[PDB]
Design a protein around this motif. Structure first.
Motif, PDB file in Angstrom:
ATOM      1  N   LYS A 552      42.746  44.308  27.313  1.00 21.87           N
ATOM      2  CA  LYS A 552      43.196  44.385  28.705  1.00 21.87           C
ATOM      3  C   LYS A 552      43.167  43.041  29.438  1.00 21.87           C
ATOM      4  CE  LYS A 552      38.880  47.050  29.332  1.00 21.87           C
ATOM      5  NZ  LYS A 552      37.692  47.023  30.232  1.00 21.87           N
ATOM      6  N   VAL A 553      43.676  43.039  30.667  1.00 22.90           N
ATOM      7  CA  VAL A 553      43.619  41.900  31.575  1.00 22.90           C
ATOM      8  C   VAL A 553      42.889  42.342  32.839  1.00 22.90           C
ATOM      9  CG1 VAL A 553      45.008  40.403  33.048  1.00 22.90           C
ATOM     10  CG2 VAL A 553      45.744  40.924  30.709  1.00 22.90           C
ATOM     11  N   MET A 554      42.212  41.425  33.531  1.00 22.74           N
ATOM     12  CA  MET A 554      41.414  41.820  34.698  1.00 22.74           C
ATOM     13  C   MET A 554      42.231  41.899  35.990  1.00 22.74           C
ATOM     14  SD  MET A 554      37.596  40.604  35.949  1.00 22.74           S
ATOM     15  CE  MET A 554      37.998  38.856  35.873  1.00 22.74           C
ATOM     16  N   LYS A 559      43.469  36.258  35.517  1.00 23.34           N
ATOM     17  CA  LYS A 559      43.979  37.078  34.419  1.00 23.34           C
ATOM     18  C   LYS A 559      43.469  36.633  33.033  1.00 23.34           C
ATOM     19  CE  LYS A 559      46.494  38.208  38.027  1.00 23.34           C
ATOM     20  NZ  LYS A 559      46.907  39.527  38.591  1.00 23.34           N
ATOM     21  N   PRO A 560      42.166  36.832  32.774  1.00 19.01           N
ATOM     22  CA  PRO A 560      41.617  36.604  31.443  1.00 19.01           C
ATOM     23  C   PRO A 560      41.909  37.750  30.471  1.00 19.01           C
ATOM     24  CG  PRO A 560      39.861  36.844  33.117  1.00 19.01           C
ATOM     25  CD  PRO A 560      41.146  37.300  33.724  1.00 19.01           C
ATOM     26  N   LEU A 561      42.203  37.439  29.210  1.00 15.10           N
ATOM     27  CA  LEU A 561      42.386  38.474  28.192  1.00 15.10           C
ATOM     28  C   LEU A 561      41.068  39.034  27.684  1.00 15.10           C
ATOM     29  CD1 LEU A 561      45.183  37.082  25.897  1.00 15.10           C
ATOM     30  CD2 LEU A 561      45.305  38.033  28.216  1.00 15.10           C
ATOM     31  N   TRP A 562      40.804  40.300  27.968  1.00 13.01           N
ATOM     32  CA  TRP A 562      39.747  41.030  27.288  1.00 13.01           C
ATOM     33  C   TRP A 562      40.281  41.483  25.959  1.00 13.01           C
ATOM     34  CZ3 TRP A 562      34.802  43.061  29.081  1.00 13.01           C
ATOM     35  CH2 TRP A 562      34.240  44.026  28.238  1.00 13.01           C
ATOM     36  N   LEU A 563      39.815  40.905  24.856  1.00 14.39           N
ATOM     37  CA  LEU A 563      40.275  41.321  23.522  1.00 14.39           C
ATOM     38  C   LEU A 563      39.133  41.877  22.662  1.00 14.39           C
ATOM     39  CD1 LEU A 563      42.510  38.221  22.677  1.00 14.39           C
ATOM     40  CD2 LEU A 563      43.189  40.255  23.950  1.00 14.39           C
ATOM     41  N   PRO A 616      22.303  34.576  27.499  1.00 16.16           N
ATOM     42  CA  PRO A 616      23.140  33.392  27.458  1.00 16.16           C
ATOM     43  C   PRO A 616      24.242  33.576  26.432  1.00 16.16           C
ATOM     44  CG  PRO A 616      21.204  33.026  26.138  1.00 16.16           C
ATOM     45  CD  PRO A 616      21.188  34.463  26.544  1.00 16.16           C
ATOM     46  N   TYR A 617      25.313  34.231  26.854  1.00 18.36           N
ATOM     47  CA  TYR A 617      26.401  34.633  25.964  1.00 18.36           C
ATOM     48  C   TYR A 617      27.111  33.420  25.367  1.00 18.36           C
ATOM     49  CZ  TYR A 617      28.555  34.052  30.574  1.00 18.36           C
ATOM     50  OH  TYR A 617      28.910  33.577  31.819  1.00 18.36           O
ATOM     51  N   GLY A 618      27.772  33.631  24.229  1.00 20.45           N
ATOM     52  CA  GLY A 618      28.580  32.596  23.613  1.00 20.45           C
ATOM     53  C   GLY A 618      29.691  32.189  24.556  1.00 20.45           C
ATOM     54  N   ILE A 629      34.943  33.431  25.644  1.00 20.85           N
ATOM     55  CA  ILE A 629      33.634  33.932  26.044  1.00 20.85           C
ATOM     56  C   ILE A 629      33.284  35.158  25.213  1.00 20.85           C
ATOM     57  CG2 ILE A 629      32.296  34.954  27.896  1.00 20.85           C
ATOM     58  CD1 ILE A 629      34.189  33.537  29.858  1.00 20.85           C
ATOM     59  N   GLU A 630      32.044  35.237  24.743  1.00 18.95           N
ATOM     60  CA  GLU A 630      31.587  36.416  24.011  1.00 18.95           C
ATOM     61  C   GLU A 630      31.473  37.589  24.975  1.00 18.95           C
ATOM     62  OE1 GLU A 630      27.581  37.909  21.569  1.00 18.95           O
ATOM     63  OE2 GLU A 630      27.510  36.150  22.859  1.00 18.95           O
ATOM     64  N   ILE A 631      31.985  38.744  24.558  1.00 20.06           N
ATOM     65  CA  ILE A 631      31.917  39.948  25.379  1.00 20.06           C
ATOM     66  C   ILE A 631      30.538  40.560  25.231  1.00 20.06           C
ATOM     67  CG2 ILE A 631      32.634  42.372  25.514  1.00 20.06           C
ATOM     68  CD1 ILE A 631      35.505  41.478  25.054  1.00 20.06           C
ATOM     69  N   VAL A 632      29.838  40.743  26.347  1.00 19.37           N
ATOM     70  CA  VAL A 632      28.591  41.501  26.349  1.00 19.37           C
ATOM     71  C   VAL A 632      28.932  42.959  26.595  1.00 19.37           C
ATOM     72  CG1 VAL A 632      26.486  42.056  27.593  1.00 19.37           C
ATOM     73  CG2 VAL A 632      27.039  39.660  27.085  1.00 19.37           C
ATOM     74  N   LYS A 633      28.579  43.811  25.638  1.00 22.14           N
ATOM     75  CA  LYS A 633      29.009  45.206  25.649  1.00 22.14           C
ATOM     76  C   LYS A 633      28.245  46.024  26.694  1.00 22.14           C
ATOM     77  CE  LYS A 633      31.647  45.390  21.658  1.00 22.14           C
ATOM     78  NZ  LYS A 633      33.086  45.770  21.568  1.00 22.14           N
ATOM     79  N   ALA A 639      28.875  44.170  41.848  1.00 22.02           N
ATOM     80  CA  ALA A 639      29.842  44.532  42.885  1.00 22.02           C
ATOM     81  C   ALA A 639      30.529  45.873  42.600  1.00 22.02           C
ATOM     82  CB  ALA A 639      30.877  43.429  43.049  1.00 22.02           C
ATOM     83  N   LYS A 640      31.031  46.043  41.378  1.00 23.41           N
ATOM     84  CA  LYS A 640      31.690  47.286  40.958  1.00 23.41           C
ATOM     85  C   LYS A 640      30.765  48.505  41.078  1.00 23.41           C
ATOM     86  CE  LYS A 640      35.607  48.935  39.062  1.00 23.41           C
ATOM     87  NZ  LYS A 640      36.991  48.581  39.489  1.00 23.41           N
ATOM     88  N   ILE A 641      29.471  48.311  40.838  1.00 23.47           N
ATOM     89  CA  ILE A 641      28.495  49.388  41.036  1.00 23.47           C
ATOM     90  C   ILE A 641      28.421  49.775  42.521  1.00 23.47           C
ATOM     91  CG2 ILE A 641      26.074  50.074  40.851  1.00 23.47           C
ATOM     92  CD1 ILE A 641      25.876  48.422  38.315  1.00 23.47           C
ATOM     93  N   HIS A 709      23.729  36.524  34.955  1.00 22.68           N
ATOM     94  CA  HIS A 709      24.763  35.789  35.693  1.00 22.68           C
ATOM     95  C   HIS A 709      25.926  35.402  34.811  1.00 22.68           C
ATOM     96  CE1 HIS A 709      22.361  34.523  39.464  1.00 22.68           C
ATOM     97  NE2 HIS A 709      21.678  35.503  38.847  1.00 22.68           N
ATOM     98  N   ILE A 710      27.062  35.117  35.436  1.00 22.00           N
ATOM     99  CA  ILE A 710      28.262  34.726  34.715  1.00 22.00           C
ATOM    100  C   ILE A 710      29.063  33.731  35.552  1.00 22.00           C
ATOM    101  CG2 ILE A 710      28.376  36.883  33.379  1.00 22.00           C
ATOM    102  CD1 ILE A 710      30.614  37.831  35.216  1.00 22.00           C
ATOM    103  N   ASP A 711      30.219  33.329  35.031  1.00 19.73           N
ATOM    104  CA  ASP A 711      31.131  32.391  35.675  1.00 19.73           C
ATOM    105  C   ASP A 711      30.434  31.231  36.383  1.00 19.73           C
ATOM    106  OD1 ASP A 711      33.818  33.286  34.873  1.00 19.73           O
ATOM    107  OD2 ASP A 711      33.368  35.121  36.007  1.00 19.73           O
TER     108      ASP A 711
END
Ligand code: 5MT
Length: 823
Positions: A552-554, A559-563, A616-618, A629-633, A639-641, A709-711
């Motif tokens: 998907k895309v955000m 617009k990052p690709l979630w793959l 500390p994700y890849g 970026i490594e996806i943390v599952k 914010a979404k919460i 944290h991210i970004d």
């Protein structure tokens, strides 16, 4: 013959053989010079251990990971094909001692092996299983063939009392009012030895002077690595700079005509040091100069004073040395030599513009029995490789100490050792060669070396030629198998990059494009996406087929690709996909540095039996504002919460978001426990690094409670995010002291004083971070933040009083800064 060199080029992302942007042969000299260290390390490495690269550590197992074992027993599931027996083993058992209790044990799902002469408590994979509470699934496999890693074979200066002088002919620019003057600096480190200006002329698109600037320094007093730095000012303001090494790589004084293309400005910044000249000949300002076979050679105290000296040796790396301090250090040279910690300050007391002094400095370096005997201090070793030291012998004594590091610790500091190469005066250095051989000795170090080097070549014109030469030197001895892997990895991410960019354009965040995306992805499944490739951020995992359903895309502005991909390994005993986010927009070289500092902080805490479950994700930069970026599952933003249950903020939400995602109350408590550790860690780390005041759409939480944290690539304030909804989970309302909230406070203080036991290390890492990766935030004031943040000088007790107050400043402000954002 030459098609292999063209292979190396597309792998490197730069043409090393090119000479369109050089004014001497230093790069080619460094190519020819690096052959020896390569051939040595190639010829000396064990081809079998090289093929299986067992990732092992010599550290003690921490107290927290000890009490997770059931008395000298660990279960290790071995697999044959279908059936799989489960063995009891003692931590001190060698892989061989488990086998009897040729073939080799490989971890299930990964190109990772458990082999060699160390106990199973000393393999990282086994410490990873123990940490997360997982079961060590190995697979009896055939060793990989060392054939596959084969490599394709292949007048004196001190007799000259003349004052140094340089003729400035003029500057030319093809397109531009005010007046303008050239400033010419003789430099050594950031130290300016000697300065001379021109008279100010009118700033037209050509300005000539024909002037000799005579410097006060003499040819014999010029030290190796002395930069002639040329700068153009126009109430003044710096507009363009360039540098030229006055003494070349053969130890010769540099003579003749030079038309040097200069760098523009948009300040301690590693770009301001480079010997590289602007390759953009068409747009760039140039300066024209003239210099006119001169070669360089190569070779008790009062009580009060002792205290003053020890007080100086005791201060932090950023505490400035006065002339009084310097003259003291230098005069009591041999007392200062007894203390490894004095070395940085001692060598910052040397007058490098004075032949006789340097002479005595090298004398003092020959008598360094205490240095060689000292226990390795990476903090101290790092300082000598920073921008304040440009002398080979000073810097070589630092690289000496690095030789003793075990491979696991090289990995910890690799990114910043690589960035240290930006402070080397010359393309060939102890440091470059140290990176080179350690990379060729170990496939894991070499893997990441490759990406780290490649990240810079792809987007730094200031250093892409140097790194390019060092990368080629790696590639020419890594082995045919790895060349093939890098080639795959490069091909794959180039495809995926194209798709990412093209799709970014198609919006001004619609879901009609979702099909257009899944179109390109589906239509890249056959040509030319290979059936397997190593995840660049985790060279264990191979990735095979996509999962176009899940990609998907955000709802974003970038617009990052979630793959997600399937793991190409059949022996993979799981169903989990390998997730990767491809993003353009942010510069991820800043995220790499921060994340690497985070792993450093973890390992620090490990030395004090502390764990704060940081995540500390890849993350690997790959080009101009682009990387993975490594996806943390199982994770979502804070914010979404809030936006699901309110759309505007409320306290409770987080806790029953947790509880709803917790299947059994059993686990839920494991989650809120995880949250207190995680939260404290990120509060500690972000205060220290000064990136704590973040906007809650940049903070994430897993379904098992782990906060992160991210970004990181990015009125009245708050020292870090500790909002009410975080407090709520802990169980404190406005003003209370919950059993967990005191544990949070307890952990924070333990972790905070834990970092302070490595102040020097953090100061130097943080200074280097700013200078080599973050062009904007590079002044004394910016750098000195981490002194304040770490409360240098203050005692442990006062420091706890300092941190706990900071906690309170957040408490005092609840939701203010969070809300203030929407405006
Ligand atoms: C913001 C979040 N970041 C991360 N997510 C997972 N793992 C990570 N390592 C990160 C980071 N950094 C994220 N990036 C995305 C890129 C593309 C995409 F389609 C989704 C992305 N998300 C993400 C993940 C979970 C939930 C959300 S959401 C529903 O918008 O709140 C976004």
């Amino acid at each position: 013959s030459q098609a292999f060199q063209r292979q190396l080029t597309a792998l490197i992302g730069y043409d090393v053989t090119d000479v369109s942007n050089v004014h001497d042969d230093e790069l080619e000299f460094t190519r020819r010079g690096l052959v020896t260290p390569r051939m040595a390390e190639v010829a000396s490495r064990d081809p079998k251990l090289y093929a299986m690269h067992p990732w092992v550590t010599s550290k003690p197992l921490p107290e927290y990971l000890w009490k997770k074992i059931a008395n000298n027993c660990i279960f290790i599931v071995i697999h044959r094909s279908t059936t799989s027996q489960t063995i009891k083993v003692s931590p001190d058992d060698t892989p061989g001692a488990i086998l009897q209790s040729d073939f080799v044990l490989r971890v299930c799902g990964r190109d990772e092996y458990l082999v060699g002469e160390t106990p199973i408590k000393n393999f990282q994979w086994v410490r990873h299983c123990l940490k997360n509470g997982e079961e060590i699934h190995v697979v009896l496999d055939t060793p990989p063939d060392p054939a596959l890693d084969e490599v394709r074979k292949e007048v004196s200066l001190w007799d000259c009392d003349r004052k140094f002088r340089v003729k400035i002919r003029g500057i030319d620019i093809p397109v531009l009012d005010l007046t303008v003057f050239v400033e010419a600096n003789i430099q050594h480190g950031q130290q300016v030895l000697c300065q001379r200006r021109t008279s100010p002329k009118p700033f037209t698109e050509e300005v000539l002077w024909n002037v000799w600037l005579e410097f006060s320094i003499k040819i014999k007093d010029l030290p190796k690595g002395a930069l002639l730095n040329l700068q153009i000012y126009c109430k003044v303001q710096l507009l363009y700079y360039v540098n030229l090494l006055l003494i070349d790589h053969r130890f010769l004084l540099r003579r003749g005509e030079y038309v040097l293309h200069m760098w523009q400005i948009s300040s301690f910044n590693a770009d301001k040091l480079t010997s590289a000249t602007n390759p953009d000949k068409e747009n760039s300002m140039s300066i024209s100069i003239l210099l006119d076979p001169i070669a360089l050679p190569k070779h008790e105290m009062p009580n009060q004073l002792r205290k003053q000296l020890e007080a100086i040796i005791a201060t932090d790396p950023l505490n400035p040395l006065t002339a009084e301090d310097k003259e003291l250090l230098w005069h009591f040279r041999y007392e200062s030599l007894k203390h490894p910690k004095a070395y940085p300050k001692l060598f910052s007391s040397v007058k490098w513009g004075q032949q006789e002094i340097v002479a005595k400095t090298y004398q003092l370096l020959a008598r360094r029995e205490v240095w060689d005997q000292s226990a390795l201090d990476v903090g101290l070793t790092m300082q000598l490789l920073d921008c304040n030291f440009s002398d080979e012998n000073v810097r070589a004594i630092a690289v000496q100490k690095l030789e003793s590091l075990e491979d696991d610790d090289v990995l910890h500091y690799l990114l910043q050792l690589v960035q240290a190469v930006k402070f080397e005066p010359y393309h060939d250095s102890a440091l470059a060669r140290f990176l080179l051989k350690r990379g060729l000795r170990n496939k894991r170090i070499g893997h990441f070396l490759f990406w780290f080097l490649r990240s810079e070549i792809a987007q730094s014109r200031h250093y892409q030629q140097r790194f390019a030469v060092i990368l080629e030197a790696y590639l020419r001895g890594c082995g045919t198998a790895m060349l093939h892997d890098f080639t795959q990895q490069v091909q794959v991410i180039e495809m995926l990059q194209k798709v990412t960019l093209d799709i970014k354009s198609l919006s001004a965040v619609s879901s009609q494009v979702i099909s257009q995306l899944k179109q390109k992805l589906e239509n890249l499944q056959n040509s030319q996406l290979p059936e397997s490739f190593r995840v660049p951020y985790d060279p264990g995992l191979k990735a095979g087929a996509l999962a176009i359903e899940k990609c998907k895309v955000m709802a974003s502005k970038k617009k990052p690709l979630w793959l997600e991909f399937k793991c190409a390994d059949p022996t993979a005993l799981s169903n989990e996909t390998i997730g990767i986010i491809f993003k353009h927009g942010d510069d991820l070289r800043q995220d790499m540095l921060i994340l690497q500092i985070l792993r450093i902080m973890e390992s620090i805490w490990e030395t004090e039996s502390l764990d704060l479950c940081l995540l500390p994700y890849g993350c690997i930069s790959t080009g101009d504002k682009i990387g993975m970026i490594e996806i943390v599952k199982d994770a979502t933003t804070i914010a979404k919460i809030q936006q699901s249950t309110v759309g505007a903020f409320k306290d409770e939400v987080l806790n029953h978001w947790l509880k709803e995602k917790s299947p059994t109350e059993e686990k839920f408590q494991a989650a809120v426990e995880r949250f207190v550790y995680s939260c404290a860690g990120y509060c500690v780390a972000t205060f220290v690094l000064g990136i704590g005041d973040r906007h809650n759409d940049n903070i994430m939480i897993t379904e098992t409670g782990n906060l992160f944290h991210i970004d990181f690539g990015h009125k009245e304030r708050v020292p870090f995010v500790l909002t009410p909804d975080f407090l709520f989970v802990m169980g404190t309302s406005g003003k209370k002291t919950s059993p967990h909230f005191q544990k949070f406070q307890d952990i924070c203080v333990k972790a905070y004083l834990a970092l302070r036991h490595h102040t020097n290390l953090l100061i130097i890492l943080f200074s280097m971070m700013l200078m080599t990766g973050m062009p904007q935030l590079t002044s004394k004031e910016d750098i000195e933040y981490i002194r304040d943040a770490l409360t240098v000088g203050k005692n442990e007790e006062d420091a706890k009083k300092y941190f706990l107050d900071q906690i309170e400043v957040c408490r005092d402000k609840g939701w203010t800064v969070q809300f203030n954002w929407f405006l």
